[PDB]
């Protein structure tokens, strides 16, 4: 995967790590928007998937 990330300038809430997909060997977490700004029209929900091995770089 060569996809980076979204705008972190928005106050999100990452909830539900979800079940680990035994197919791709990854896990997806959902981030929900709780408050935005005037000079920042952000999305209501975001999705992020990471390796089931829990690697952070």
């Amino acid at each position: 995967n060569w996809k980076k990330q979204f705008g972190a300038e928005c106050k999100y809430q990452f909830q539900a790590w979800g079940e680990c997909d035994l197919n791709t060997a990854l896990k997806t977490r959902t981030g929900s928007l709780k408050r935005a700004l005037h000079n920042a029209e952000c999305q209501k929900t975001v999705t992020i998937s990471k390796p089931c091995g829990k690697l952070t770089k």
């Binding site: 935005a36 700004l37 005037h38 000079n39 920042a40 029209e41 952000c42 999305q43 209501k44």
Partner: protein, 184 residues
């Protein structure tokens, strides 16, 4: 004698509470300035543009409360510049219901931040000024707390901007605008 069009920002930065206030404000304006020779038009915008009722439709159903009630929030980004250009070309078009010789008045109620708009104000203001479109800006949220938002409002409002920029929470503003509308 006058053609008034409403442009309301319904982006994601628009809190449902204030969006509601916009609708209430518009309805009150249409209920207060209800003249036998006065039509109204309203178009909401974000990244897209949705006309809810033209001058013709309002001429068929002169019920402000019934035209503003079904108005839902679009959400998304802001296209104030692109919107202004569209308003002076589509909203104020004879085919939609715009009249000739009648004065053009555009009330812009934006969040204050035109983010995501590929067009600038310099690309639409010289156009709106040529077609003879008077601009009135109503600031909401933090539009008067930030410098960038304040100046933006002063760039949309016809000069002098001070006498053409009012607060959405300013109830006396309606009587003020209605006053200047006499010295058109």
């Amino acid at each position: 004698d006058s053609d008034i069009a409403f442009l309301i920002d319904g982006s994601g930065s628009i809190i449902p509470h204030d969006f509601r206030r916009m609708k209430e404000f518009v309805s009150t304006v249409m209920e207060q300035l209800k003249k036998s020779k006065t039509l109204f038009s309203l178009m909401q915008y974000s990244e897209e543009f949705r006309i809810h009722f033209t001058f013709k439709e309002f001429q068929n159903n002169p019920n402000p409360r019934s035209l503003v009630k079904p108005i839902t929030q679009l959400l998304g980004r802001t296209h104030t510049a692109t919107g202004i250009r569209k308003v002076v070309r589509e909203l104020f078009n004879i085919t939609n219901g715009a009249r000739k010789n009648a004065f053009k008045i555009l009330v812009v109620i934006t969040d204050g931040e035109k983010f995501g708009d590929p067009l600038g104000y310099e690309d639409v203001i010289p156009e709106a000024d040529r077609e003879g479109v008077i601009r009135y800006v109503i600031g909401v949220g933090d539009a008067f707390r930030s410098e960038k938002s304040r100046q933006e409002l002063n760039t949309i409002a016809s000069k002098p901007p001070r006498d053409h920029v009012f607060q959405v929470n300013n109830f006396e503003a309606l009587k003020t605008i209605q006053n200047q509308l006499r010295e058109k």
